[PDB]
Amino acid sequence: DGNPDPNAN
Amino acid sequence: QMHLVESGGGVVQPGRSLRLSCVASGFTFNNHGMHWVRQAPGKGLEWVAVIWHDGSNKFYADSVNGRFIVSRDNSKNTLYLHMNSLRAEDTAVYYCARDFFVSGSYNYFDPWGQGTLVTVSSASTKGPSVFPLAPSSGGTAALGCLVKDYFPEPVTVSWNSGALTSGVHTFPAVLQSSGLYSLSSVVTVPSSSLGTQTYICNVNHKPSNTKVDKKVEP
Amino acid sequence: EIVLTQSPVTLSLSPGERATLSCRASQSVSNYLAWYQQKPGQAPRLLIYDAANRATGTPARFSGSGSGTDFTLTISSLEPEDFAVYFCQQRSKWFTFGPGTKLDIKRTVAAPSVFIFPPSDEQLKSGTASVVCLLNNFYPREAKVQWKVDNALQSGNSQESVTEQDSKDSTYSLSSTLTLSKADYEKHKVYACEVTHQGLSSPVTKSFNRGE
Q1: Were both Cys, which of B149, B159, C65, C134 would link to B164 (CB 3.0–4.6 Å)?
Q2: Where are the beta strands (DSSP E) in C43-112?
């Protein structure tokens, strides 16, 4: 689950 | 090598504003979310804010939401923290940290900067008073200097211009209810040396340009 | 918020021993947990992430495991550089940290040497009196220091400060400072510091008579 990924994809 | 360096910390009155900066090198800055994390003096770590790699989203800890604003300039490889409506409880070392991601994992902090200290207080600059702790346990005696009522941190204390370090304990400063700091530096010496050797504490408080040498006799 | 609790609050071990540190989350965080190490005056360093993966540069003696709410960091064969503070951190619901477990070097018990300092005449001229009690070179860190003024226990007018564990003899030193107004100070005669510590067969009292 967690938090939305803040890094570039 | 990867490197993060913060700047902008200092003494700020409650209600005032302050901007912190973090410059990055050694990794692709625009691929990473970036974080601010803080640590109150002698306390644990508290996450502050996160900003997306492209600046599109920003999230905040409950304790700072609406008072702090995070931003970034990828063209300068720099992260910012705009601190408004500052309160005494915001006093802390502020670290910038990269969002570490590998494989499917993310949202861990690596690397970290060295931190910048923000001191939020209504106190005014004050130079310390330096009082002797005069020697009055068998063969060993103790003496020192009480460095009382200064603002802000830090002060530095040496003994005999730095020649004496054996047996010296300089205690961490404490914050008094007045808002002023206080500390003591002590040294244990042979009791038979009290009337024959000399012990001078050298106290430096740069914010007040205070430079005091105090000879400590029985 | 997800609260992380760390036990034990302090851990005292000798080099070469195995350390076991626990982190418990107030609700499940899956395996989204990291461990950080911090030495005095330094920034934290990432050690373990996703509960069990070693970060680059983390030595093999560090290992982590856990899931849901219960997590464990193990340090095998402690090295001197391993004595520091360790924080856990979850990333399941935003980001929160545990309060840290402090790991210090276990040495033989050492009783403090106790000294008491009356206020100087120069400070009394300013209207305030600071009375200082020094506990020098003791182990373990736990100690009780009480101020008694004409046999009355003082509460709320003293502050303590403690050094970091000494790099040379693994001991601690501690100061307790009793702060009174000049008028309050001169109302009483006997100023006493009572020290209770595991290394003392009986508590030690150091005292003086004001003005003598």
Answers
A1: B159
A2: 45-49, 53-54, 62-67, 70-75, 85-90, 96-97, 101-105
Separation between Cα atoms, residue B199 and residue B143, nearest integer Å: 9
User: Checking DSSP bridges between strand C10-13 and strand C101-105, what pairing results, if any?
Assistant: parallel
Distance from CA of C77 to the nearest CA of B (A): 25
CB crowding C114-140: b at 16 or more within 10 Å, else e: bbbbbbbeebbeeebbbbbbbbbbbbb
Q: Distance, in angstroms, between C5 CA and closest chain A CA?
A: 20
From residue B22, give the alpha-carbon distance in Å to each of A6, B90, B97, C59, C189: 18, 18, 9, 29, 56
Q: Which chain C residues are closer than 8 Å to B110 by Cβ?
A: 45-46, 55
Residue B190, helix vs strand vs coil: strand
C74 lies in the same domain as C119: no
Q: Minimal Cα–Cα distance from C9 to chain A, Å? A: 28
User: Sign of the CA dihedral C21, C27, C31, C36?
Assistant: negative
Domains of chain B listed by start with CATH number: 3-120 (2.60.40.10), 129-215 (2.60.40.10)
Which DSSP symbol is given to C184? H
Q: How far apart are CA C184 and CA C87, in angstroms?
A: 44
Question: Is B218 in contact with B195 (CB distance < 8 Å)?
Answer: yes
Shortest distance between the Cα of B49 and any Cα of chain C, in A, equals 9
Q: Resolution to 1 decimal, in Å? A: 1.8
Question: Could you tell me which chains touch chain B, where touching means 3 or more CB pairs under 8 A?
Answer: A, C
Domain enclosing residue C138, as ranges: 113-209
**Partner-chain contact A8 B31, CB within 8 Å:** yes
- Are C162 and B172 within 8 A, CB to CB? yes
**Residue C93 at interface with chain A, using a CB cutoff of 8 Å:** yes
Contact B50 A6 (CB under 8 A): yes
Experimental method: X-ray
Q: C180 CB contacts (<8 Å, ≥6 apart)?
A: C128, C129, C131, C157
C119 lies within 8 A of chain B by CB: yes
CA neighbor of B84 nearest in space, from B60, B68, B63, B62: B68
- Selection from C203, C182, C207 nearest residue C192 by Cα: C207
Say yes or no: B217 contacts chain A, CB-CB below 8 A: no
Q: Provide the b/e sequence for A1-9 (b: ≥16 CB within 10 Å).
A: eebebbbee
Question: What CATH number should be reported for the domain holding residue C87?
Answer: 2.60.40.10
